[PDB]
Design a protein around this ligand. Sequence first.
Ligand SMILES: *O=P(*)(*)([O])(OP([O])(=O)O[C][C]1O[C](N2[C]=[C][C]C(C([N])=O)=[C]2)[C]([O])[C]1[O])O(*)[C][C]1O[C](N2[C]=NC3=C2N=[C]N=C3[N])[C](O(*)P(*)([O])([O])=O)[C]1[O]
Ligand SMILES: CCn1c(Sc2cccc(OC)c2)c(C)c2c(N)nc(N)nc21
Length: 186
Amino acid sequence: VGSLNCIVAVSQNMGIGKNGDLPWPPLRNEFRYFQRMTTTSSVEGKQNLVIMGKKTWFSIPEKNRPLKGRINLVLSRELKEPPQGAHFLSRSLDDALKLTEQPELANKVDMVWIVGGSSVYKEAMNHPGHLKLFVTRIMQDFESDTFFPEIDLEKYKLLPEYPGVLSDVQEEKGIKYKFEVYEKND
Ligand SMILES: *O=P(*)(*)([O])(OP([O])(=O)O[C][C]1O[C](N2[C]=[C][C]C(C([N])=O)=[C]2)[C]([O])[C]1[O])O(*)[C][C]1O[C](N2[C]=NC3=C2N=[C]N=C3[N])[C](O(*)P(*)([O])([O])=O)[C]1[O]
Ligand SMILES: CCn1c(Sc2cccc(OC)c2)c(C)c2c(N)nc(N)nc21
């Protein structure tokens, strides 16, 4: 199994969701970028795995589920099986990651992408090890009911460039946003 990564899009006041949807109106290229980053392997004959909490899964439009060309794994202690359309179910982040080391998954999985929500991000961010955060900065405040955890810039370095990620500002529907990559290794 390769890289462990988080990917998120966040507002200026650290917002990631509101009422089970994004705080902002849909941004076409942000969706494209999320799709491109989580799908693209760098290891022939392998697939990336996406790990998300239950609320995150159900927040994706049913038509868009499962995230195609990726192995879809949902985190939940209440569910007894994977949701309709999902591939795997685990009862914790550790278990999910433990699960990648099984004869089954071990040789099929390139990158692992945590795609939210807050609690999943928090646990990954605070766990020792090599981790990147792919952060889309939505450059306004938006009304939100769930937030991205604190990024500790003592451990997470903002990268000055990263291949296949743009460095300038984008804008859709009057909303400016930028892509960022942070790395820690501890
Ligand atoms: O953590 P969750 O997925 O839900 P949260 O934090 O409320 O997120 C949903 C909101 O945020 C948006 N969003 C999601 C990802 C990225 C993103 C962005 N802008 O990039 C935005 C969505 O649109 C929503 O508005 O789910 C909570 C349930 O999942 C289970 N959970 C989380 N973590 C674990 C876990 N189960 C087991 N282990 C772990 N580590 C829990 O399920 P339960 O209650 O046990 O059945 C949580 O309830
Ligand atoms: C495209 C919006 N979006 C989303 S919601 C979404 C995800 C995939 C498909 C989809 O179809 C409308 C919606 C998530 C979970 C997500 C994420 N973790 N990181 C970034 N940078 N963007 C994200």
